[PDB]
Amino acid sequence: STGSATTTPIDSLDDAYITPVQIGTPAQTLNLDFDTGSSDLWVFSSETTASEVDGQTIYTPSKSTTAKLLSGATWSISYGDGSSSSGDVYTDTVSVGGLTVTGQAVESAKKVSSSFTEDSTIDGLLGLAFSTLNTVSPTQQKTFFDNAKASLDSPVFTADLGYHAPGTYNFGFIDTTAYTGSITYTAVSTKQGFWEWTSTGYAVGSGTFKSTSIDGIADTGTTLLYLPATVVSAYWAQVSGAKSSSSVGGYVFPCSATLPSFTFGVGSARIVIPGDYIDFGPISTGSSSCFGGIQSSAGIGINIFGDVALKAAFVVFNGATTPTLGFASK
């Protein structure tokens, strides 16, 4: 089997991407944020505290003939950005892009933090990291990908995120029309439950490539690119008037600037992030200070190849016995 679903940016800055997911019988379609940095599939639901719901579509298990309470199971998650959610658990049929899993754990939120309530366009998250990070207790549950894997033509999914445009998530096949050149595969460590890999270095604009190992994760649920302070300072030093602002919480730059590209290494291959991808617009409406898409990972404890980086590439998440990541230009 295979599945193919279009993913759409939630706003004009590509802050996140939503992908329609069918849950239950008859289908209830919710728009979920596919998140390679976490391992819970959770939804706004009929059980969500009413004051914490503001425009989201909700999953109502009582209206699904295939829903079953997973008796005694609870979940609670805290994300790297300080956001959180918690609740109880149903099993139900879940379909993405034509690919169906029966008996999928659907984590029903009772509580969500303010950042989720404020995002009316995101009805939940679909985690695609390793199932070792799943928060269900007392019985840890599998991700949608882990449950689908054995049925798929190939044990893979691909992320093809658009710049200010829709893209695609594919399960079980590699669309050879979706990328240019060849796919370069690189080793993955699953020791922390993430798609953790090592970039071979970077370049700023037309500058020379610096060979240096940068360990980090491929995280579709993170908007920006978080890299060591040395690398980030080297990038922003090439932009007149760029500075790190403690008051704003990162590097900002004049909205009049033209940003240089940023290149990262995947083995002997190179992925180029155009400068425009690094512009996240005014820090506040009407400001001439713009927020940068490349930020320091200092204090986060890990480097994060978020959407800024991944949208520059066709990305293969290879869930074979020995997992690997693949990157192609597109």
Side-chain angles (χ1 to χ4, degrees), residues 1-62 64-67 69-109 112-141 143-148 150-190 192-242 244-330:
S1 59
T2 63
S4 181
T6 298
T7 195
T8 300
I10 64 167
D11 64 22
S12 68
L13 297 180
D14 300 345
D15 281 312
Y17 298 80
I18 52 174
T19 311
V21 175
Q22 282 73 46
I23 310 177
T25 308
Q28 298 177 42
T29 296
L30 275 68
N31 297 325
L32 302 188
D33 186 350
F34 285 22
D35 181 13
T36 64
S38 68
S39 302
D40 290 48
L41 191 174
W42 74 259
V43 296
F44 279 81
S45 77
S46 57
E47 301 180 331
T48 310
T49 303
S51 66
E52 292 177 359
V53 184
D54 186 11
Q56 293 80 10
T57 293
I58 64 169
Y59 171 55
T60 304
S62 68
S64 174
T65 61
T66 42
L69 177 76
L70 185 61
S71 185
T74 64
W75 62 278
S76 184
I77 194 157
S78 306
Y79 295 107
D81 70 342
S83 66
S84 61
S85 52
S86 64
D88 56 13
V89 186
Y90 296 79
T91 57
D92 208 341
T93 300
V94 171
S95 300
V96 177
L99 166 68
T100 302
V101 170
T102 61
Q104 176 65 47
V106 177
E107 300 171 38
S108 161
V112 303
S113 63
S114 63
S115 60
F116 290 115
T117 298
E118 293 163 1
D119 225 319
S120 67
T121 59
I122 293 175
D123 300 326
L125 271 60
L126 191 149
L128 294 168
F130 292 89
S131 294
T132 56
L133 296 176
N134 175 270
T135 75
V136 178
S137 177
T139 310
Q140 189 169 60
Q141 301 293 303
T143 70
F144 175 84
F145 179 56
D146 213 342
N147 284 325
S151 308
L152 296 175
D153 291 358
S154 184
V156 302
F157 69 86
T158 68
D160 183 5
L161 299 180
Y163 173 60
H164 292 171
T168 305
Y169 281 100
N170 292 330
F171 292 82
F173 69 107
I174 289 167
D175 180 359
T176 62
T177 74
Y179 62 87
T180 60
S182 55
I183 306 176
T184 298
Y185 291 85
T186 199
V188 163
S189 172
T190 65
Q192 295 192 92
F194 297 121
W195 294 89
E196 184 170 3
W197 65 292
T198 303
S199 172
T200 50
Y202 67 100
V204 175
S206 60
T208 60
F209 185 86
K210 176 70 168 180
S211 293
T212 188
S213 292
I214 306 171
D215 297 345
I217 68 170
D219 183 4
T220 60
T222 288
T223 313
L224 305 185
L225 173 56
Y226 294 87
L227 288 176
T230 50
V231 175
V232 171
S233 181
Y235 177 82
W236 287 108
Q238 297 305 311
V239 180
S240 298
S244 181
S245 170
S246 50
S247 51
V248 177
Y251 282 87
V252 296
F253 70 91
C255 295
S256 59
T258 304
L259 296 181
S261 63
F262 184 88
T263 299
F264 63 96
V266 182
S268 65
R270 306 289 177 252
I271 300 288
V272 179
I273 306 173
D276 283 359
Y277 289 28
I278 302 163
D279 180 1
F280 278 77
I283 61 170
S284 303
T285 308
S287 181
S288 70
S289 297
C290 281
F291 198 68
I294 296 175
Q295 295 294 344
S296 181
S297 63
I300 303 174
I302 200 154
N303 304 305
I304 307 176
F305 294 81
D307 301 332
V308 162
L310 299 182
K311 72 181 72 172
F314 177 89
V315 190
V316 181
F317 293 84
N318 171 26
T321 306
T322 300
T324 65
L325 283 164
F327 294 79
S329 295
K330 63 185 186 191

